[PDB]
């Protein structure tokens, strides 16, 4: 099979932009205030 | 089969924009205030 | 079969915009105030 | 006087998030399909 | 005087979230299909 | 006077995040499909 | 007066993140598809 | 099968932009305030 | 007066991150597809 | 099979830009405030 | 007056990171596809 | 199979840009504030 | 007056990192595909 | 199989640019504030 | 007045890093594909 | 199999640029503030 | 007045690193593909 | 098999540039502030 992700961005003026892609992966994260 | 995600963004002026894609993945997260 | 997600955004002026896609994934999250 | 904007975000798992702030500015944008 | 805007967001799992703030500004936008 | 913008972000797992700040500025943008 | 912008980001795992600050500036942009 | 990720970005003026790709990987992260 | 911009970033694992600051400047950009 | 990641960036003026690619790898990170 | 920009970055593992500062400058750029 | 990563960057003016590629590797990192 | 820019970077493992500073300068650039 | 990484960069004016490639390697790093 | 730029970098392992400083200068560049 | 890394850089004016390649190697590093 | 630029770099292992400083100078460059 | 690394650099004016290649080697480094 075909598994694809696409993301096209166009702008006259851009201040903040971000693109993130995740495919077939294991992500684990922990956060502690103190 | 075909599994696809698409996201097109166009703007004259953009201040805050973000695109996120997740496919076939395991994500685990924990948050603690203190 | 075909499983697709699409999202097109166009604007003259954009201040806050975000796009999120989730497909065939396991997401677990925990939040603690203190 | 005091003019302030605040935005706090916390999440166990976040896929798409964006924050935009505009203060005392002139923004002009134009969009054309073709 | 005091002019403030606040926005707090907390979630165990978040897919799409966006925050936008506008204060004392001039925004002009135009859109054309073709 | 005091003019301040703040934005705090915390997450166990983050895929797409973006922060944009505009203060006392002139932004002009134009977009053309073809 | 005091004009300040702040942005703090913390995450266990981050894939896409971006921070943009604009203060007292003139930005002009033009986009053409063809 | 074919597994592909694409991300095209075009802008007249860009201040903050970031692109992140993850495929078939194991990511583990830990955060401690103090 | 005091004009300051701050941006602090901390993460266990970071794939894509970018920080941009603009203060008291003139930016002009043009884009042409062909 | 074919596993490919692509990222094209074009801009008249760019201040902050970053591209990150991860494929078939093990990443482990730890952060301590003090 | 005092005009300062600060940017601190800390991470256990970093793949793509970039920091850009612009102050009191004139930037002009042009892009042509062909 | 074929495993490839590509990243093309073009800009009239670039201040901060960085490209990072990781393939089939083991990365371990530790951070301590004090 | 005082005009200063600071950028501190610390990481256990870093693959791609870049820092750019511009102050009181004139930058002009042109790009042509062919 | 074929495992390749490519990165092409072109700019009229470039202040900060860096390219990093990692393939089939073991990287270990430790950081201590004091 | 005082005009200073600082950039400190520390890492356990660094593959690609670059630092660029521009102050009170005129930079002109031209690029041609063919 | 074929394992190749390529990196081409072209610019009218370049202030800071660096290219790093790692293939099939063991890298270990330690950092101590004091 | 005082105009100073500083750049300190420390790393356990460094593969690619470069530092560039420009102050009060005129730089002109031209590039031609053929 | 074939294991090759290539890096081509061309610029009208270059101030800081460095190229580093590592293949099939063991690198160990230690750093101490005092």
Numbering used by the authors:
A (entry chain P), B (entry chain R), C (entry chain N), D (entry chain Q), E (entry chain M), F (entry chain O), ...: 43 to 76
The authors write:
Mitochondrial proteins CHCHD10 and CHCHD2 are mutated in rare cases of heritable FTD, ALS and PD and aggregate in tissues affected by these diseases. Here, we demonstrate that the low complexity N-terminal domains of both D10 and D2, as well as the full-length proteins, can form amyloid fibrils in vitro and in vivo.
Although many mutations associated with neurodegeneration are situated within the ordered cores of D10-NT and D2-NT fibrils, other disease-associated mutations occur outside these regions, including the p.R15L mutation in D10, for which we observed evidence of amyloid formation in patient fibroblasts. The resulting structure was nearly identical to the WT D10-NT polymorph-2 structure, indicating that this mutation likely does not alter D10 fibril structure. Interestingly, however, this mutation appeared to enhance D10-NT aggregation, as assessed via ThT fluorescence, although not nearly to the extent of the S59L mutation. This mutation also leads to signal loss in NMR spectra comparable to that observed for S59L, suggesting that it too promotes intermolecular interactions. In the case of R15L and S59L D10, the introduction of a large hydrophobic residue is likely responsible for enhanced intermolecular interactions preceding aggregation. Although such patients are quite rare, we were able to obtain skin fibroblasts from patients with the p.R15L disease-associated D10 mutation. Staining of these cells with the amyloid-specific dye Thioflavin S (ThioS) revealed ThioS-positive punctate regions that were co-labeled by an antibody against D10, indicating that these cells contain amyloid aggregates, likely containing D10.
